[PDB]
Amino acid sequence: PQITLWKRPLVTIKIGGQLKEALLDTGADDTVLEEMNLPGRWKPKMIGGIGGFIKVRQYDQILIEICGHKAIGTVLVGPTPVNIIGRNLLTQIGCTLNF
Amino acid sequence: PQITLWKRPLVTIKIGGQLKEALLDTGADDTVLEEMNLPGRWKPKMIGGIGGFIKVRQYDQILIEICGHKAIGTVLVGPTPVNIIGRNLLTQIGCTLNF
Numbered sequence: 001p002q003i004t005l006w007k008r009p010l011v012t013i014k015i016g017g018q019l020k021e022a023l024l025d026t027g028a029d030d031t032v033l034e035e036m037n038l039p040g041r042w043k044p045k046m047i048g049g050i051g052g053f054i055k056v057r058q059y060d061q062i063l064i065e066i067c068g069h070k071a072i073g074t075v076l077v078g079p080t081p082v083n084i085i086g087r088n089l090l091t092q093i094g095c096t097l098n099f
Numbered sequence: 100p101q102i103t104l105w106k107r108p109l110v111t112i113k114i115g116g117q118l119k120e121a122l123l124d125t126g127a128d129d130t131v132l133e134e135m136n137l138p139g140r141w142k143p144k145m146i147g148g149i150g151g152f153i154k155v156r157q158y159d160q161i162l163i164e165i166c167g168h169k170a171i172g173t174v175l176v177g178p179t180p181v182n183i184i185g186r187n188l189l190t191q192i193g194c195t196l197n198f
């Protein structure tokens with residue numbers, strides 16, 4: 001769509017044959033999702049934000065669908081309290097900020 | 100104008116006399132800038148994200164220019180490593196996500 005920001009920009013995502021809600025985030029370099037089993041091998045990673053760092057597992061070339069828009073790319077899993085769609089995936093669905 | 104997301108969506112702001120860069124951040128509720136000098140009476144406030152939380156200072160009715168769009172709102176001030184423009188001002192300047 002064209003989505004307003006009066007309300008948080010949380011959309012429906014599909015990943016792993018599971019439906020989740022996530023936040024379209026121009027403030028995130030990377031896509032980080034709450035704890036979930038996922039296929040293939042991973043590598044260790046840290047991400048930072050407000051008030052420090054946390055550890056995550058990087059998985060590559062993952063199929064995700066975001067309001068019906070398919071993308072394959074990197075997805076990180078760990079103790080985020082919010083499912084976040086970051087720029088690496090927002091680009092793949094054509095997402096822009098406009099005003 | 101249009102901001103595609105291949106790089107961090109950075110923009111020029113003008114606030115309390117000064118020129119700065121700040122990130123347009125759709126997953127930020129509030130606006131939060133690096134330590135600076137704003138006027139008069141402020142209240143404590145707590146904001147958190149990945150990894151933890153910070154203590155900030157809340158300044159209300161602060162005037163700000165964001166990419167030539169004027170806005171008046173709550174600016175938060177504290178130890179964030181990046182200046183963040185949140186939905187509180189993104190809404191005032193007519194900012195939406197398009198895909």
Ligand SMILES: CC(C)[C@H](NC(=O)[C@H](C)NC(=O)OCc1ccccc1)C(=O)N[C@@H](Cc1ccccc1)[C@@H](O)[C@H](O)[C@H](Cc1ccccc1)NC(=O)[C@@H](NC(=O)[C@H](C)NC(=O)OCc1ccccc1)C(C)C
Nearest residue numbers: 027028029030047048049050124126127128146147148149
């Ligand atoms: C989502 C992350 C992957 C993202 N991180 C990155 O992309 C980082 C910079 N990149 C990165 O880590 O890459 C690898 C790296 C980096 C540096 C060194 C080595 C390796 C990030 O945290 N980005 C944040 C900005 C930032 C950048 C640098 C440093 C510090 C902060 C926000 O823009 C991003 O949009 C998040 C989303 C979020 C929110 C909550 C939990 C988890 C994620 N918002 C926030 O952190 C904001 N918090 C909020 O908006 C919350 C929801 N509000 C809040 O506390 O409100 C009051 C409240 C109080 C009490 C209860 C409830 C609410 C903040 C900017 C205002």
Ligand SMILES: Cc1ccc(S(=O)(=O)NC(=O)Nc2nccs2)cc1
Nearest residue numbers: 014015016017018063064065070071
């Ligand atoms: C676009 C899109 C379709 C379907 C999903 S799904 O139902 O969550 N799971 C999968 O497709 N898994 C996979 N199948 C083959 C390789 S990875 C997610 C995203």
Ligand SMILES: Cc1ccc(S(=O)(=O)NC(=O)Nc2nccs2)cc1
Nearest residue numbers: 113114115116117161162163164169
């Ligand atoms: C459009 C635009 C003009 C001027 C500015 S300014 O010089 O940075 N600030 C102000 O003039 N006044 C205030 N700042 C804080 C409270 S009242 C900012 C934006």
